[PDB]
Point group: none
Chain length 281, copies 6
């Protein structure tokens, strides 16, 4: 998701910025200020410890409060040998004045009285963790929504399985009545005892009993994966394939309009789920 | 949608390409980085599929744009005990100028996104209106080829019975292989010639009502699209006559054209 | 003081005081000469412990035929420097190699470490393999007891020559020995791949795909929750391995 | 006008007017999104067809409580520019993609071309393979006629059961059918490798090593100048192939 | 090798610099001036057409003759709106003078009257090829030396083969006299007719006749490879391995001190050659 | 070797690491780029093996260091019709200063390379003097182990004859395999026990005179070094007694220590 926090201390104001995008692995980038490039390893690990996946861009922005630094700290000794060097010229050259503003714009004469960066970073680090709290909270929140609507599709799945278990007896008699009706057009004498073994070992497979158990087993297993705190929902995308393998198993074996037209909604449910699982840790 | 306000004019531009799922990314500026999720939520709430290209930049106004009084004062003092003001000026910290007020500018900016999403939705419904038409066009052609087979059906029940009998007669003199090979093949296949015709006419019915909904029907079609072909090839490999062999081709051909016009469907 | 401050990636794309801009190619070459890949950010920490003026008089006249504020600090007074830069820079290059010692060791550290946690998942696969062999006998038994139970409610009278035929053609449906044998060989094969000193960061990635093709082969094969429930852990284990192999 | 001015190498490490420094990340991303590897040097050709001044008066007094030569040209008069930079830069990004079209085609051109000249050496190997099968029969004959000729000057009296044994154990020494069969299969295998649209620039390099192990196997096997003379051309052909495959 | 040529024309002086180092493939780098970055492809190909291997660094150095350019070309129009902008300030600010030197240091006011770069590069390209001539000549020259001393080792090789063909008859009788002498210590009865077939099929192999022919065939083939103008001496390094395979074949089969001590010089000759072949195209 | 002249002092530093072949590369500066081959030829002419690290830099002297009269003149003129001279000064083309004269400085520089090559050659002869000693040390130990086997030789001719007889007696009752397996094995191997001793004593002789030459003997040793071991393992796999088995070990052990002290030899 996203989060930022301004701080504003005795030295200046600071602002953290974290954002997260769908990535397969965990990756992080850091565009920090220049005073704190010695902190980057601590922050990186502090992230990996609380995140496991996602491309995350973490940024800190430093606004220095010049009113409190004071800067200056005149190297009075160097300025003087700048003054004397200015004098040995002003005399030999026999011309010219001596601007002090120029004498100031020497690299080593005006060192900015840097502020307790060890105290500035000490309060920043306290704010880095404070944002991760606000960041993870933003990510769990969003997680609570998908969990519900994924479990929502699961209930829609259950509505689709039992609806199929219900039409199997009605369909398998119609295939018995259809297949046999040709044997009379074939004029062939009624096998009777040889028919039954053929009608059985033809209904199985062709009748959906096995995978419905699997799909129902998948639904049970799906719920607990969403209800664990451990190695999160990356495996869900895998289950959606197993869900799908039992779905398509039903597609190329189904013998009735009524079973197939409902079996599409399944494929719809899987994909609806397959979209919201890409947002799961 | 261009807006021009009190501090300058901005311009939005949204695009869509084509993806199986919904995934938006935003390359907004950096002066305007606190809205990316707000925009994200307001966009994702209205769409279901497609890779979407969102927003460019607001060109800042200069005529609508803070010197350091205290620091400049202590700089002269350090400088005199040791005078252009312009040099005293081109120091990083004396001017700078914060000049922030995005909390008033963005409110008029954000109001246009829903206005922009309409123009995105309007553009895709527009593009959508054509596909609805030409998909229903292949269907009428489908239906025309459906009854054309339905008309030749009686000859098939006479010609396919004689095929089945040919299997029962060849198996006469032939040893007893069992009933499975000669019968489950020549019975499961004869019942189909008429059977999928019932399905296909039903597929056509089921296809049309799917098209008149306000929900997400892009995969529901593709699922149906596989169903069309599986009953089609079932009919293809049962080809005993020229007209049936040639008709199942037009069928399969009609199916595929859809598999591109459905590729643009959300 | 040298500081390497970078993770691991590919090529290497190295990154790099005002007195030492003449070393940047030298350092670049001396680093890449010893290591493979990865983006490296290199920063150092330097904290210290004329003739033209004669030719300047000439400038004052030819412009008139003047001011110290302009010509005040000259670059060439600070280029040739004041401290023997050719002797001070000498300890720097000698210490850079000294950090590289600790840099490679730092990379071997996790490298030897990632090796350890990859070997963790490898054992678990075998644990998931043998866990599969554990639920198999009851399955060929419950599917057998099921298949027979279905024919008797149907009361279809029994013929042994055909009885066995479904009992086999289901036993060869449910059978998962082939992929277990392949997979049991895969875990074995990885360890010796893990025991080479060479360029094996692709050889591992190939192996992880072998797992996925055999994981998916067995996943798309058997009949039970327990088998599919085991088939989840495999890809979970695979991806866990694949997250750490992309860094080699 | 865009200009790409770079050869082929790996990663890609892209390189890049004063009004357009705000595009450098945008261009970087839009290029790498479409291509594989190689060092690319990108240059463009741009040829064109206040409020602060008010806050400046303030500066003149607080320093005294002054000069146009200093504040003369201000940056912010030239930053916001004078021409609509937001509309002119728009044709540039649209044309960059236009050059990329011609850039990929330029790389496919040689890519389709290197493919051709690699296929040249491939045919020659087969020509060197069949050229080997050509000198074989006389060799099993001249070594046979030699071996027998050596036993008769020595006058060693002949035994057929042992005669054949050297005639075989030399015939299986001189034999080079195995590596020719392997090699004849190699050339066949390369062409279909050459007919894929994917990441085959390693698959080729593997094949060229297969050649060298079989080249060296046959080189280190037979007995004749003609065989060794043929074994030279192989590695010559291999290296010739390997010079052009390192660019894929 | 190496070559450079100064030019000095009506516009300034120019200097090419090429150097070549032992590389397996052909590679080239170009550090050109800034006025001629539009020439780099022509030069690259102009090199590949004349070179086949070697890492080559090609450099051009431009020394502009400021005396002939003249520069200036005052944008009198822009300078005036610089003057007026300077005036609208000088008046409002109520202070200050107007330096023209500052008005000059505007990017667009002083455009250096660039010189016919299309005429400068036209004479440079004529000098680029002139150096390649001097470069390749430097490389052939050096080539003529290695060719001689490699063929020099070849003669030393021939001295080593015939010296071996000469001692074979003397050695093979001593191995006959040695091997048989144990059969008497073995007390075993003299095989006679069974001995001869064993003494023959033991001398071959063990006697160096086959590979000597090969080595002599290698020497013949080596000479013509050095004497072709075509696909140059890269294959020589390969032949040195074939030379070496016949050398070592002689090492582990040799039965005499006298044959082996000479067979070392062979291995010495190969390596002496194997060093000078790394400098061959 | 440090030299200090009229325009500044320079310092050479040469190093050697260790390579099988000779290959020199030079990282000299850029002010001094016209000598790299001259130095190359003068170096390569004296060495045969080794990867060699050559030369650093000359620190330029400032007290031993050209304004534009004409351009500065036409700059003032353009400037006045429209004056600090220092600004007129910090233009790229008015000062610059060529200040070249490497044709006089390098002559004293180049003269020291032969002086430096001596110090390179002196350093390696120095390092060489130790290896010559300790290689000849393993050899005396070799010789001591040579005669120790030569002393036990008679027992071997008695013990190896009984081994050969054991092969002729086992083959008695045994079917006629032929003469090759029992005889070429047990004859080619018995003749050796004494044979390589003649070679090894000769190897030692041949080794020593190789060491007293002024030419390139580094591979001549390594060739010999393989010869030592091939007669050694021939003697190793003929091990019938404890003392012979244990003696052929010290032999092989002595050989290998050399294969490191020869690794530093040119």
């Amino acid at each position: 998701a996203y989060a930022r926090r301004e701080i504003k201390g005795e030295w200046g104001s600071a602002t953290w910025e974290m954002r997260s995008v769908n990535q397969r692995y965990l990756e992080t980038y850091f565009r920090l200020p220049e005073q704190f490039r010695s902190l980057e390893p601590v922050v990186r690990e502090r992230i990996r410890s609380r995140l496991t996946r996602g491309k995350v861009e973490c940024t800190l922005r430093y606004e220095p409060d010049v009113s409190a630094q004071g800067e200056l700290i005149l190297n009075e000794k160097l300025a003087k040998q700048l003054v004397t060097a200015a004098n040995w010229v002003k005399m030999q050259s026999d011309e010219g004045e001596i601007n002090p503003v120029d004498i100031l714009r020497w690299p080593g004469v005006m060192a900015a009285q840097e502020q307790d960066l060890d105290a500035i970073a000490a309060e920043i680090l306290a704010a880095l963790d404070g944002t991760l709290d606000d960041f993870i909270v933003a990510r769990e929140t969003e997680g609570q929504a998908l969990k519900a609507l994924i479990e929502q599709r699961l209930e829609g799945v259950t509505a689709e399985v039992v609806k199929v278990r219900s039409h199997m007896p009605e369909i398998l008699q119609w295939q018995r009545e259809r297949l046999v009706a040709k044997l009379e057009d074939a004029q062939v004498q009624l096998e009777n005892n040889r028919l039954e073994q053929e009608l059985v070992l033809l209904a199985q497979r062709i009748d959906v009993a096995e995978e419905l158990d699997r799909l129902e087993a998948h639904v049970k297993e799906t719920y607990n994966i969403l209800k664990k705190k451990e190695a999160v929902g990356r495996r869900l995308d895998f289950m959606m394939q197993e869900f799908n393998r039992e779905s398509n198993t039903l597609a190329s074996k189904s013998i009735n309009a009524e079973v197939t037209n409902s079996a599409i909604e399944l494929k719809v449910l899987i994909e609806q789920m397959r979209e919201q699982i890409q947002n799961i840790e």
